[PDB]
């Protein structure tokens, strides 16, 4: 499923991400934008041979099990394929574990390089939340 900007903002707000650990909603919407262009089905292979999955490109090196990433963990305790559902619940749950892991949203290189230090609240502008 490909979300609208405000459609994703509102689902992410419903699921508790607005200001989770101090990261306003616009941060999460900006991350989704540059990770997956709002597409729950997005997949991309990393150089180390892990793969990233879903709306927030959550990676199989640490967070989920894809059955093919040697020397990896599954700290979110889920199949990576669960991150590709039109229901964003598992993505959201697993991102709350990720963003509490000590590096915050810096865990997402794309947030660090694309969203960090920008006017991220522009990503929820005009949205009914």
């Amino acid at each position: 499923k490909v979300f609208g900007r405000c459609e994703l903002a509102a689902a992410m707000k419903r699921h508790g991400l607005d200001n989770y650990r101090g990261y306003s909603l616009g941060n999460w919407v900006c991350a989704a934008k540059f990770e997956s262009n709002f597409n729950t089905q997005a997949t991309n292979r990393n150089t180390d041979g892990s793969t990233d999955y879903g709306i927030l490109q959550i990676n199989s090196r640490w967070w989920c099990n894809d059955g093919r990433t040697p020397g990896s963990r599954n700290l979110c305790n889920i199949p990576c394929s669960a991150l590709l559902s039109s229901d964003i619940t598992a993505s959201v749950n697993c991102a709350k574990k990720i963003v509490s892991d000590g590096n915050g949203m810096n865990a997402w290189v794309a947030w660090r390089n694309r969203c960090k230090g920008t006017d991220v609240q522009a990503w929820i502008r005009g949205c009914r939340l």
Side-chain angles (χ1 to χ4, degrees):
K1 162 172 194 177
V2 185
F3 278 78
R5 184 173 57 86
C6 299
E7 199 191 1
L8 189 56
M12 286 188 157
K13 182 173 179 44
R14 316 306 185 227
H15 293 288
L17 282 178
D18 198 2
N19 277 291
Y20 188 90
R21 302 280 168 279
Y23 291 93
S24 67
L25 194 51
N27 284 279
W28 302 104
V29 176
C30 183
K33 169 71 178 182
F34 296 126
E35 291 300 0
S36 63
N37 202 28
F38 306 143
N39 176 14
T40 62
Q41 303 201 70
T43 56
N44 293 283
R45 199 79 184 256
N46 293 314
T47 58
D48 72 352
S50 60
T51 298
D52 304 331
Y53 296 85
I55 198 126
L56 289 165
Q57 292 289 275
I58 294 174
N59 134 97
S60 56
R61 176 61 49 208
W62 297 103
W63 306 109
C64 64
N65 185 19
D66 69 4
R68 78 171 192 189
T69 307
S72 85
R73 322 276 309 268
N74 182 10
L75 301 165
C76 292
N77 184 229
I78 37 165
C80 299
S81 64
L83 299 171
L84 306 181
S85 169
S86 58
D87 178 351
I88 73 158
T89 290
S91 283
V92 167
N93 280 345
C94 180
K96 299 172 161 163
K97 293 163 195 145
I98 297 173
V99 77
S100 314
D101 96 348
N103 289 304
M105 289 195 66
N106 294 294
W108 290 267
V109 177
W111 177 87
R112 181 176 61 87
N113 283 333
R114 318 213 43 199
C115 300
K116 195 182 188 173
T118 74
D119 183 34
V120 289
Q121 286 289 115
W123 289 104
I124 80 177
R125 206 145 274 161
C127 305
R128 272 184 204 150
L129 302 185

